[PDB]
Design a protein around this ligand. Sequence first.
Ligand SMILES: O=C(O)Cc1csc2ccc(Cl)cc12
Ligand SMILES: O=C(O)Cc1csc2ccc(Cl)cc12
Ligand SMILES: O=C(O)Cc1csc2ccc(Cl)cc12
Ligand SMILES: O=C(O)Cc1csc2ccc(Cl)cc12
Ligand SMILES: [Zn+2]
Ligand SMILES: [Zn+2]
Ligand SMILES: [Zn+2]
Ligand SMILES: [Zn+2]
Lengths: 357, 357
Amino acid sequence: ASMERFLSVYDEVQAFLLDQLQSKYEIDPNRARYLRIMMDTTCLGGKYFRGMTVVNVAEGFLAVTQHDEATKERILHDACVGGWMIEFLQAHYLVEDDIMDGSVMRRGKPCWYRFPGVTTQCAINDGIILKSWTQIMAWHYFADRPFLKDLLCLFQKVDYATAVGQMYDVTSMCDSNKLDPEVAQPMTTDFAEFTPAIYKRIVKYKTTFYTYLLPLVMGLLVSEAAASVEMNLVERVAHLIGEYFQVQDDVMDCFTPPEQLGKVGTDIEDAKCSWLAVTFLGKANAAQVAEFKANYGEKDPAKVAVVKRLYSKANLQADFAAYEAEVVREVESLIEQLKVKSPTFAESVAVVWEKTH
Amino acid sequence: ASMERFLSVYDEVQAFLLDQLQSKYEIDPNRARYLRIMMDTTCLGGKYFRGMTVVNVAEGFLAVTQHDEATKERILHDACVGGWMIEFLQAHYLVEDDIMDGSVMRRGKPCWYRFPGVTTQCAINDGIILKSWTQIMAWHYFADRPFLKDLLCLFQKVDYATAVGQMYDVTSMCDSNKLDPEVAQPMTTDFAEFTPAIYKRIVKYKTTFYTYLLPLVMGLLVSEAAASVEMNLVERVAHLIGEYFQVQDDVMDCFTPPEQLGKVGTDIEDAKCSWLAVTFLGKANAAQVAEFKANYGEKDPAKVAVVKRLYSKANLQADFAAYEAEVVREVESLIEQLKVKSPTFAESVAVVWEKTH
Ligand SMILES: O=C(O)Cc1csc2ccc(Cl)cc12
Ligand SMILES: O=C(O)Cc1csc2ccc(Cl)cc12
Ligand SMILES: O=C(O)Cc1csc2ccc(Cl)cc12
Ligand SMILES: O=C(O)Cc1csc2ccc(Cl)cc12
Ligand SMILES: [Zn+2]
Ligand SMILES: [Zn+2]
Ligand SMILES: [Zn+2]
Ligand SMILES: [Zn+2]
């Protein structure tokens, strides 16, 4: 099965990377063990949604395309390697983002930089190595492949879009007109930049390119199937599903209990431009807006409890139901448009949506 | 002239990157200004030795190769773009290394992360963007170039070697057998790993690939001149000159006054595996070794002053003179071997050596 092939390829890639460090980079066994532990701790334990989307898209095409058995095996192995490039790209951004944000946990486990024998000094570089490994595995496994050029170019643009999104996110509680490397940034007092368009831009770049666009397009590239789709349509459906995914994460940060969330949610304390804050500001009256400004972006638990009460009272659940209903209409419309050129790819998008929704 | 062409291309590359952020990445003017300031602050103000080595190697080949004038202009523009990819790669590693090390200054200016309106939260991501920009400029400027594949593959391997070297450096004061993500790392008490071979490995990977090998090989690639050299010989001369460069930096960290150094040197406090510590341990008697162990890797100024006194008393200046004499013999031997296939490239190596020495 797909998951078992995917996990087996992780062991193969790891062995290759570590053997190459020994044969070419003069690594010693203790540092190779540190790196093996770092790779397992940062890359494993999740759902592998991104990596498995590449494999699922590739298997959809295998069902409808004539190939020798050895070719089907090669395509699946390429989809697994490609899927691991995305999982390692994610691992790079989670390691770095956890250090940037001073995060404590991620999925009921301490953040990598918090491990006693790691520290921020190592962890920042470990994050750098994680991304460097994505390129090492591409050049090694896809050296003779016709899709190598397109895959490297796509991967670079998605990585860049992600870093641009991280910039939009970390600066989301500042006033744009006040941004200045020379002056410490005050948190906004007016919240004028907490709008649906500004929120959409953070989410589009920070998450949707690496979580949805990259796995779908990589599945097409390893299958040599990019002519079966209109790329503008794949972009629109990736950004749409990706946004819905983040709206879910945002609601969960505030209302999902820490035991289920796998961390203590701090979007309110961090003054993040969340779906809840933007949607609340789109419907609140004068007194509610004023109460929001006097309590948002503060570590004080009483102030955090005021914000959480305003959200519950504002009936944000109704806004979510309306938003979700709108997303369902649009996702179905885009799936219908994809069916024109590829029913197989349209079906893979339907699975990705079902897994998100 | 070469420097003026190089600096003009910086303005062109910057304009391209910022215009693309506006046209494709939905950036607003204030964030574009933040990124312009970040790029200028982290990429400019140095000697441009790495970037200018690419241009110098390319101009050596232009003097001896028949080309149309438009081709000479294209090669020089490519050498400038390539040179900026290396300067931006350096900027990425200096931004991240300064955060990793908790550095205060670099070249008489505060480290980027210390700027009031920057902070570590932004700076880590700014460092990520700096490296992402190297790939954006390669795919844009070299899209149709025959050397694009080789240049991207070389750049990736050098970037990876550099991150591996940073790992060797940050772990250089730990006992290898004790490395463990689960356990806080004690500083070595025996200093058994402060050997010439271990020192050589840190330096080879941390600095020599991006400072010497990459500029020389990029100059060959943009000139389509890689067949004029034995790559094993270019590697050996890059690693040799690169090591000598680091031995100089190490001596300067301890003995060059802070006003001239552009920072307060902390290798002793940081327990770094420096050329001075390794060379001292290679000649010290029992009492001197014991005094070294009781004072090294400590913030205490009196303890730092004991270490500095042991180095002066050990006549490390004589060891440096002997080392420098050995490097001169070997660099001349390698330059002689390079003259066989390319007197022009051998001359560029001679200039790189003269600039280092
Ligand atoms: O256009 C997109 O959405 C994705 C993309 C970026 S570079 C590249 C190269 C080849 C193919 Cl098929 C797609 C892409
Ligand atoms: O997806 C889009 O709307 C088009 C686009 C804008 S920046 C960027 C970076 C990478 C890729 Cl693959 C696509 C895009
Ligand atoms: O072999 C080296 O030292 C440098 C290197 C790494 S990948 C690559 C591709 C083409 C050329 Cl000409 C050199 C290199
Ligand atoms: O320079 C060498 O001795 C050969 C080598 C080992 S790891 C590595 C990474 C990148 C390049 Cl360009 C060369 C090498
Ligand atoms: Zn974050
Ligand atoms: Zn969240
Ligand atoms: Zn450092
Ligand atoms: Zn130094």
